[PDB]
Nucleic acid binder design. Structure first.
Lengths: 213, 25, 136, 62, 98
RNA sequence: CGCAAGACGGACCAGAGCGAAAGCAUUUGCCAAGAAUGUUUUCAUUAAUCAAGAACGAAAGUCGGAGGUUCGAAGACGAUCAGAUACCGUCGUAGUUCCGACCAUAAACGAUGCCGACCGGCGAUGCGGCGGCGUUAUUCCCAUGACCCGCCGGGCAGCUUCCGGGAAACCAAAGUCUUUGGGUUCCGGGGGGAGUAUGGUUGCAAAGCUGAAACUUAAAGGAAUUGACGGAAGGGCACCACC
RNA sequence: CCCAUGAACGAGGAAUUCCCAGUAAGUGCGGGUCAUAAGCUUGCGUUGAUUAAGUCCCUGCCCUUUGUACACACCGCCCGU
């Protein structure tokens, strides 16, 4: 005998300053009615945001998980929680008659963020190649995987969240692997396919307000 | 009669013969 | 039931998790999050007959009822997350998928980005039905 | 939605379970450069006008 | 009488491959034995792409595809008319139909 | 959103590789092993096949622990049906997973023992080596990768052929067979009875290996051809079909 | 033949037949039968349409490929208590 959506306040969602297009959308919460607080029950919502919505003019297939780390007031301030690939793109890349190569790196940034980057790579049929197969040797594959693991530790351990995400928005890690591995086996469709959030440090609001200018 | 189920019936029949020969020992 | 955003320019996006099994179809609009649901309707809610819970008509009625309840709370657009049963079972969306998606397009709503979110395993547990399978 | 008229420019085949429907290439005589394929009951020849109660369906070809 | 030279499967120097579960039934089929399709498919067929293009928020949005790999048992495949009985000469053609 | 446990390693994944076979598919490290190629290295007949004897041996099954996610014999229930101790469905114990011991069997198949020689062709492919215009990466060239073009050896195979063989299907081996002899092991002798009885032996058990006879019977069977039929696929026709 | 009596039947359930042009259907008249004789049949005109110029959906038939332990041939063959 009562409309439950009459008790909801539509709070706006803000992306950090490393993205061009600012606001993502809105998200309704219940008003602080008794013990439960809006802000406390709102502080763990994950937004799967296509990068073409979030950046002005980039590829659309990349997605960014964004948790509402803190709420200022009518503003869900978000922080990075994991890059992902649209399975449309991920499946599209995996075709027969070539070697799929993957490499995961359990890594830590300068500040207390622990990531789990997942690289992917596909051996390229050359311009003059008549042979259908286009496969790599097992030692060629694990030389590539060793390079992938080296390059991803190199481009995460030296810099912070904001700079590695500005390396994730282009294919700075993916294109560097694609360059470095030409001498081993020329592979073409080389991306970081997923980043996963494992540890964050104790929350500082000064750190998040530096992420939001 | 499938040759597998023939082999199953001959095993049960043997298993009853070993059960009935044992009771004189 | 008011999204207090500006009159014209800006759109109130949501996301509908369209779960199309072969023996039922769900149309489930949520907020950008997914954690706060706006409206949910299945096929078996609309049809008084157990055999055609997954029928494309049940999914059409479902999507129309959602898109009506969705326009009330002030949601203009929808992202889509199409889902099939998945796991060890079938990874094709059921016959209510295309009817429900077409229906809410026809029923006024705007369409953002579409993707499959089907639970595809690396390799799951042993699938139901025996060695010799589902004989009929 | 309005009730529109379309002219049969080509009668493609005979579809339907009992072959009871001509499948027809129709040209919209309002928007004179828009054409769709469309199922029709009864005897149809080239250059007779169909009354469409909606102009947004399109039949699946033979 | 030996009907197929390969024995209807594609192992020559193994003696065992892993069983896949048939997608239609749940039948356990040797991987090499199974009749495999790779269905790329647009999430909407023909009638709904007309509607999405008009009710899309975006500027000439290319629609996403749904990448299934179907594994069939021989019985499911023939019943569902994926494969088909052929003449003893025409059986030997390994060319996929156009 | 998380958290936990236990299974399993999709897509890449192939008439691809490796392994004596059973079998083997996430990453990284360690531990020993192995084929093939390369060799103007060494020993110098050390070999091939094998009664006895020995190692390994899918799944199921057994005994003692650890674990129990899913699936699931038995079981209970709901359906179908005339009945339905089936097929379908909801649950569901043993089991399925791990360690330690058994077990020793599979349509364990290539239904094709191993070693050796000889006898057409062609395109591929996997591994190693060798040679060759040219593109390409390390750019700063060297030499290595990625391709391309050939050669050689060994490998899984493939296509073609009046080698030749075969009852034929078919087979570069199932050929070199009445023009019959390269070496060697196992094994068959019409169909049943019967892999039964009985004795031995192995096993905790289930069962394994070895293994008859009386009696019974004119066929059982193999390949191929023509028909008929099909609840297999496709094509065509008819107001004694339909619309 | 005459007078008289004046029942059901208010367009037909499941199912099913025949038919595309002078056709269907309406309508009578001949022939066969016939001593007596048409609710039948076989012919003839007369009046004269609806719909369709298609398909393999149903029902049959015929193909081609396929499988077979069938061959007086699926009403076949055949297994166990």
């Amino acid at each position: 005998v009562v409309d439950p959506f009459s008790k909801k306040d539509w709070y706006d969602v803000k992306a950090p300053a490393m993205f061009n297009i600012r606001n993502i959308g809105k998200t309704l919460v219940t008003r602080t009615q008794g013990t439960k607080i809006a802000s406390d029950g709102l502080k763990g919502r994950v937004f799967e945001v296509s990068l073409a919505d979030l950046q002005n003019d980039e590829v659309a297939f990349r997605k960014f998980k964004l948790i509402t780390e803190d709420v200022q007031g009518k503003n869900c301030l978000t922080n990075f929680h994991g890059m992902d690939l649209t399975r449309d793109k991920m499946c599209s890349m995996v075709k027969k008659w070539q070697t799929m190569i993957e490499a995961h790196v359990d890594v830590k940034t300068t500040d207390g963020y622990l990531l789990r980057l997942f690289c992917v790579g596909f051996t390229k049929k050359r311009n003059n190649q008549i042979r259908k197969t286009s496969y790599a040797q097992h030692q060629q594959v694990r030389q590539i995987r060793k390079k992938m693991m080296e390059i991803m530790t190199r481009e995460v351990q030296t810099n912070d969240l904001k700079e590695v995400v500005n390396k994730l928005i282009p294919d700075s890690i993916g294109k560097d692997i694609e360059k470095a591995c030409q001498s081993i086996y020329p592979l073409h469709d080389v991306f970081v396919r997923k980043v996963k959030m494992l540890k964050k440090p104790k929350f500082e609001l000064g750190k998040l307000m530096e992420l939001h200018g | 009669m499938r040759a597998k189920w023939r082999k199953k019936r001959m095993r049960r029949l043997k298993r009853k013969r070993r059960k009935m020969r044992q009771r004189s020992k | 039931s008011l999204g207090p955003q500006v009159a014209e320019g800006e759109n109130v996006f949501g996301v509908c998790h369209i779960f199309a099994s072969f023996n039922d179809t769900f149309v489930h609009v949520t907020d950008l999050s997914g954690k706060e649901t706006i409206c949910r309707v299945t096929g078996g809610m609309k049809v008084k007959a157990d055999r055609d819970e997954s029928s494309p008509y049940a999914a059409m009625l479902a999507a129309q009822d959602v898109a009506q309840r969705c326009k009330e709370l002030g949601i203009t657009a929808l992202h889509i997350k199409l889902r099939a049963t998945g796991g060890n079972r079938t990874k094709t969306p059921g016959p209510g998928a295309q009817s429900a998606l077409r229906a809410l397009a026809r029923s006024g709503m705007k369409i953002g980005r579409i993707e499959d979110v089907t639970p595809i395993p690396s390799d799951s547990t042993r699938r139901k039905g025996g060695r010799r399978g589902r004989r009929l | 939605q309005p009730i529109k008229l379309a002219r049969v420019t080509k009668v493609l085949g005979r579809t339907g379970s009992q072959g009871q429907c001509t499948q027809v290439r129709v040209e919209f005589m309002d928007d004179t450069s828009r054409s769709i394929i469309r199922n029709v009951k009864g005897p149809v020849r080239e250059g007779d006008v169909l009354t469409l109660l909606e102009s947004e369906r399109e039949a699946r070809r033979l | 009488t030996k009907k197929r030279r390969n024995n209807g499967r594609a192992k020559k120097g193994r003696g065992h491959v892993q069983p896949i579960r048939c997608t239609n039934c749940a039948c356990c089929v040797p991987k090499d034995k199974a009749i495999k399709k790779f269905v790329i498919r647009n999430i909407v067929e023909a009638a709904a792409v007309r509607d999405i293009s008009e009710v899309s928020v975006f500027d000439a949005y290319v629609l996403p595809k749904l990448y299934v790999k179907l594994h069939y048992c021989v019985s499911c495949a023939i019943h569902s008319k994926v494969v088909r009985n052929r003449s003893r000469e025409a059986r030997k053609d390994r060319t996929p139909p156009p």
